[PDB]
Amino acid sequence: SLLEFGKMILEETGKLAIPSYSSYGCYCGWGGKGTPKDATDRCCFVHDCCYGNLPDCNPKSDRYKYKRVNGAIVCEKGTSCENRICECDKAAAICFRQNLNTYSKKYMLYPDFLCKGELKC
């Protein structure tokens, strides 16, 4: 679920998901279109594609369980949808952590009109 994902993001990065990752670039949050602005935004593009692999799952609301094995995220067994949603969220949180060094506040609240075009998953 979005609330869990926000907690996983905060745990990984030390940034609050809202507002650091909820309106960032072209894909973090509302998403849709354009060339991702930077590595962090690319994390969000891939996460959007990951959710898109799961058209009959409901990632905003479906809760999954995960644990920490020392710092590593281990998705625990739930339903198929929950397992897959967890792996998508885990990857995004790790991606955000791996790209904190280039995270840029100038991309927060990035305007939709600067995000134009395709980019297939």
Tokens representing 16? 């609050």
Distances from the Cα of 20 to the Cαs of 26, 58, 70, 116, 121, in angstroms?
A: 13, 23, 25, 22, 24
Part of the chain binding ligand IMN (CB under 6 A), chosen from 18-26, 52-60, 62-70, 77-85: 52-60
With beta carbons less than 8 A apart as the criterion, state whether 2 and 60 touch: yes
Instruction: Specify the residue, 66 or 119, whose C-beta has the smaller distance to ligand IMN.
Output: 119
- CB of residue 69 vs ligand IMN: minimum separation in angstroms? 26
58 contacts ligand IMN (rule: CB under 6 A):
yes
| Binding track, positions 6-45, relative to ligand IMN; x by CB under 6 A | -------------------------x--------------
| Binding track, positions 60-99, relative to ligand IMN; x by CB under 6 A | x---------------------------------------
Let me know the angle formed at the C-alpha of 82 by 38 and 31, rounded to the nearest 5 degrees.
Answer: 30
Q: In the Cβ-directed half-sphere of 97, how many Cα atoms lie within 13 Å?
A: 16
Largest CA distance in the chain: 43
Positions annotated as catalytic residues are 47, 89
User: What residues make contact with ligand IMN under the rule CB under 6 A?
Assistant: 31, 47-49, 51-52, 55, 58-60
